[PDB]
Chain A
């Protein structure tokens, strides 16, 4: 029941839309272990409507695709263009005018190698 309240609060953060699947919830009956099993099929459904909300607006699969194997390195044509510009600059530690140029080179290396979805690749920031 703890994890039930955790998933219903996630959908509540979006908006106030969920209802318990029965019109009235009773546990004051001699059967009680079949009622926590209809509690478990309830938080499974709350997972399914959260998995809904992942697949509709949020695109968790496209977010993990845009990060992970691309973060190891998947499409190096984004990065070998940026690796042309790691050999001219990255010889000494960063100065005060250097990290302004590094974000200018990441965004330059974005569109020379034709990214397919631009709001999934503007979330990249640069460590000092």
Chain B
């Protein structure tokens, strides 16, 4: 119960903190991680 609460906090923080840098090919990188968690 302590481990899966950490993993749930990791998977949510991995989405937002990947989607902020200065307008390079990150739109390609932000395309890929939402495709993995949902499909």
A and B touch in the complex (CB under 8 A): yes
Residue B29 contacts which of A98, A100, A103, A104 (CB distance < 8 angstroms)? A100
CA distance A65 to B15 in the complex (A): 42
Interface size class of A (residues with CB under 8 A): 10 to 19
Residue A95 contacts which of B26, B30, B36 (CB distance < 8 angstroms)? B30
Q: From residue 18 to 39 of chain B, which have CB atoms closer than 8 A to chain A?
A: 18-19, 26-36
CA distance A98 to B39 in the complex (A): 12
Residue A99 contacts which of B15, B18, B27, B33 (CB distance < 8 angstroms)? B27
CA distance A102 to B8 in the complex (A): 27
Q: Are B35 and A96 in contact (CB under 8 A)?
A: no
Q: Is A61 an interface residue (CB 8 A)?
A: no
- Inter-chain contacts of B27 with A (CB < 8 A): 96, 99-100, 128
Binding site for A on B (CB under 8 A): 15, 18-19, 26-36
Binding site for B on A (CB under 8 A): 95-104, 128
